[PDB]
Structure 1
């Protein structure tokens, strides 16, 4: 029994030993110059060979060899385009990639392998893909579901996937009529990803879509606290709490591993005020497919 759209999904049609070789169509930097670190939206051609669904991931094998002459290990990326894709023909796949740069123990700058390879791609370059992978983050079957989406940074990718399908496409068997509520936490305004597409979706389905941003370094709450995602959520504590108690409410969380703790921290308090132990309630939601997590 699934409450999610699990029927007929494809998984691992392509594998690390026999990846699908697609080509880069476009690669654009989607963060502003201010932004701490860059994020790029890149689109690849797959000619219909990767039949993915919204919520899934692909694996990427960056070109080159590891320190032992073997091929690099794959890295996973949530797909950021809906199943029809950014061109609406089902033949392309899009990624949202943050370029990883750090400094090691000796103070030397180190570029992360797959992220820099991807962010550096030029239209026409080839890229090795595996997958599709994943079941955790598939959409609910119920077209009148209340869907709450909590993302940080690149974790916006699967919710973009969802939202294109819900609001930018016409489907013969699916018409969303519920309430979708996205919270997106980023550090700067220059780090807001796809804001312009979400603003058009809001205009289109004002009654079906709610939108909240948490820009940590630029926003504060009354106490004067930094606006983190849990910080912005708390401002709607009563409402969210109420939503969580309904059977047709589904929560999805995606992004940096850290976000999980601060959210559990708000929730623990909301629940206890009600005589509810968050740890057990959360476990029951996870079991009923209502609390869906992918952090990395």
Structure 2
């Protein structure tokens, strides 16, 4: 039922880039791009929460052909234009420091993708992943804990749930539960998809809450920079009360090691009612209701 591995690295899909638009507005840190690809000519179907591979051209430092890098899909099953013809990605350009051979090193596939022109041919594999799937239940609660490009599967959920054209195209999924996004980025220019996320909250104030953790603009109560863990600590009691519902699913996506502060915050909340969180979390993972994808 769930589409998986319709294309594989030995015979990938050759898709064309349609658009490559900036998501980091002026004044932000780094480059993150929304890249849309053409899927006509082949049979690549996908659903929300899945990933695709991109194989970059040329060779590595050892002369061997470059491997795929996995990217979370930014679009719903229908694509951004709700036509069943496209797929989108949300790609950060990886750039880093001076003690790693050279002066500034740029990541291979992400610099390729972030500078790619419309009309160019791309090797696409997949879709992969059954870890970040949205339930078919319209009455489910969805907590979304996103850091940076961790917004990317959250975009696919929130678009399916709340965009007018998506609701018209999906008669079996008219969402009426509650969704909460806690989004951690460094600046207000770095709030990826800000205007559309804020449009959804103004249109659906009882069904979507939007919380920001903006590190260069806000401080936590200890005087340090505001991160996603601090906003989870601020709302730990509320989030635990929602997690107790049998129909609540929680999604964690973003940088590796973000799980640690979220676990500590929900541990203090769960302990007030005599529950050890690390054990309750194991049962949620078993039930398929605690979904993690960090990198």
Alignment TM class, shorter chain as reference = over 0.9
Aligned to 1:49: 43
The residue number in structure 2 matching 1:130 is 125
The correspondence of residues 255-274 of structure 1 with structure 2, limited to 5 A, is 255-274=254-273
Secondary structure at the aligned position of 1:172 is classed as coil
> Which residue pairs with 2:25 in the alignment?
32
- Residue in 1 aligned with 2:218? 219
Partner residue in 2 for 1:109: 104
For 1:208 and 1:272, how far apart are their aligned partners in 2? 28
8 A contact 2:53–2:71 mirrored in 1:
yes
Tell me what 1:71 maps to.
Answer: 65
CA RMSD of aligned residues (A): 1.3
Aligned to 1:252: 251
Please, what TM-score do these two structures have when normalized by structure 1? Answer: 0.94
Cα distance in 1 for residues equivalent to 2:126 and 2:101: 37
Name the CA distance, whole Å, in 1 between partners of 2:264 and 2:281: 12
Show the counterpart of 1:152: 147
Are positions 1:166 and 2:161 aligned together?
A: yes
Single out whichever of 263-272 and 73-82 deviates more from structure 2: 263-272
Task: Report the secondary structure of 2:96's partner residue.
Answer: strand
Q: What's the counterpart of residue 182 of structure 1?
A: 181
Q: How far did residue 120 of structure 1 move?
A: 0.8
1:16 match: 9
Structure 2 CA distance for aligned equivalents of residues 229 and 110 of structure 1: 28
- The runs of at least 4 consecutive aligned structure 1 residues that moved more than 4 Å come to none
Which stretch has the larger CA shift, 101-110 or 181-190?
101-110
2:137–2:173 CA contact under 8 A, matched in 1? no
In 2, the alpha carbon distance for the partners of 1:178 and 1:236 equals: 19
How many residue pairs get matched? 289
Cα deviation digits, residues 216-263 of structure 1 (max 9, x gap): 121013443321112112222221111111111110111111211111
Q: Is there any run of 5+ residues in structure 1 with no aligned partner, and where?
A: 1-7
Equivalent position of 1:230 in the other structure = 229
* Gap runs ≥5 in structure 2: none
Q: Secondary structure at the match of 1:157?
A: helix
